[PDB]
Design a protein around this ligand. Structure first.
Ligand SMILES: CCC[C@H](CC)Oc1ccc(C(=O)OC)cc1NC(=O)c1nnn(-c2cc(OC)ccc2OC)c1C
Ligand SMILES: CCC[C@H](CC)Oc1ccc(C(=O)OC)cc1NC(=O)c1nnn(-c2cc(OC)ccc2OC)c1C
Lengths: 285, 286
């Protein structure tokens, strides 16, 4: 079995996930909706390539049973139509991740600078891990309560590394304990930009990784997924590569079409404490 | 061929239609839309049967090419979700019909009370005739510019739609493949109905209706192949007779819905009887 500290470690992470992951997205309100220069022109071409890779239709299910469905247009600024909404979704998700990190005892004891640096480097990764738990691989749809995001028209989709990540991770059929441990391992990455206490974060990540390794051996005897632990660690390595690629994508689009919310601006590159006033405020409550 | 008086009649009606029928619905703006979220029971039960008869989805195409689609909920008060939009659409269509009648010389010379009585009796029918020209029978969709109203997919399929006499009328009328001139002549024959409630100059209106009918009869004889269009005029007049029965049915349906859930605009209230025609008098005086 697991040690007393290992079981309590999983118990704390699971309680954190329940307190801070709004799976029904019931409290995601007041969001935006679509339809509701030579140096600049050159940067547009690359931004158009970034936006056509992830094209989803939007579905809004009302309490009465009615459904409002948004089908995106074909490629001007029309390819930016979903950005103000996705910014509000990302910002809403990031607030839940910030709250997730705050209740973890190992994260709360860290200096405020390292708390800022770890959340900055892992925000995208923990959000994709949370999005994968509501991803329907049969329909290609992220089901976020009354909101749904359906991929628009497979081997072309799998070429997109972010979409391939969600299909591959969903195929592993992970439990909630394995997702929340993946979030812990990703959150406590010691080699994030700006981390000071490099060794103590490295030591915390090793305890979360050993706990995941021990959990799988004690709760997963089915050969359904052999080497599940090493497969998970490979997905986290791939998730770090996708994080760098898509963080560059957002900066390119933000350069010619500003959409990032004030919380996202601190999350990207738009003295550590002074440059992250909102993150510092949220991390105090 | 047609006589000069009959050609001038068709020419006046086509100009009336061109000036007053916004076929692209470009000037239908600021309309409302469904949100993003013992004896009283007998009124409700009949109204639930009344509102389940016509089930459409709403489609709004944006200028950039995007498409917002609204699928109505399944049968509370949610079965009313489309009423404010339909009240806006109907009010807009009725104004175009009033303007249509207002430029017809034979209509303006009638007494003002007969003008109001003819409009109240024919508003639904001229609205349905205009809607039929933008009805796509292959997709079951009224294409109104950037707005589209599509019959919802049902387990009964196409035969299910034919249960509603209103829908059967649109498919049957579209099957005739009528010209623009025949549509505008149908509207004139419907508008000048001498047996509407409250009509005083019964003989004058009846004589005006027969001239429009004779003109339509002569148009079909002179501009359509003799063999297969031998009874098109009689088929059209039978469609107008059936459209009048559907008018009586759906007017009663609207009054029942209004009795338990008010939705009619001020102009619609004057149209269904819900000084009595203050807005109608102003519109006819402009
Ligand atoms: C709700 C389900 C969304 C789906 C799930 C994978 O995926 C999309 C589908 C479609 C689109 C799209 O059609 O848009 C126009 C965009 C995204 N996805 C992000 O918009 C996005 N997901 N994560 N992040 C992000 C978050 C960060 O902090 C938390 C930091 C950086 C980030 O990105 C570099 C973003 C902007
Ligand atoms: C959008 C147009 C296409 C289709 C053709 C039948 O229309 C509907 C589609 C769906 C519905 C519906 O799903 O309902 C909840 C209702 C209507 N249609 C009227 O709502 C309506 N059409 N004509 N009139 C009306 C107008 C009058 O003066 C102009 C006078 C009386 C009238 O009716 C008694 C109404 C209220």
């Amino acid at each position: 079995g697991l040690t007393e500290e290992q079981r309590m470690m999983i118990r704390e992470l699971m309680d954190a996930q329940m307190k801070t992951f709004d799976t029904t997205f019931s409290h995601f309100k007041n969001f935006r909706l679509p339809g509701v220069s030579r140096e600049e022109a050159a940067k547009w071409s690359q931004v158009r390539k970034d936006l056509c890779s992830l094209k989803v239709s939007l579905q809004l299910r009302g309490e009465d049973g009615s459904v409002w469905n948004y089908k995106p247009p074909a490629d001007g600024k029309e390819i930016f139509s979903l950005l103000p909404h996705m910014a509000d979704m990302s910002t809403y998700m990031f607030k839940g991740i910030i709250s997730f990190a705050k209740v973890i005892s190992y994260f709360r004891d860290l200096p405020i600078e390292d708390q800022i640096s770890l959340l900055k480097g892992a925000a995208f990764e923990l959000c994709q891990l949370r999005f994968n738990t509501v991803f329907n691989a049969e329909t290609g749809t992220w089901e976020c309560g009354r909101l749904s995001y359906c991929l628009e028209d497979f081997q072309q989709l799998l070429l997109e590394p972010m979409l391939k990540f969600h299909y591959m991770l969903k195929k592993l059929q992970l439990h909630e304990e394995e997702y929340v441990l993946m979030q812990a391992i990703s959150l406590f990455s010691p080699d994030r930009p700006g981390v000071l206490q490099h060794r103590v974060v490295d030591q915390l990540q090793e305890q979360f990784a050993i706990t995941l390794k021990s959990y799988i051996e004690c709760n997963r005897p089915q050969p359904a997924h052999r080497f599940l632990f090493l497969k998970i660690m490979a997905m986290l390595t791939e998730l770090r590569s996708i994080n760098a690629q898509h963080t560059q994508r957002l900066l390119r689009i933000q350069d010619i079409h500003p959409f990032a919310t004030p919380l996202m601006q601190e999350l990207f590159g738009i003295s550590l404490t002074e440059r992250h006033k909102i993150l510092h405020r949220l991390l105090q409550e």
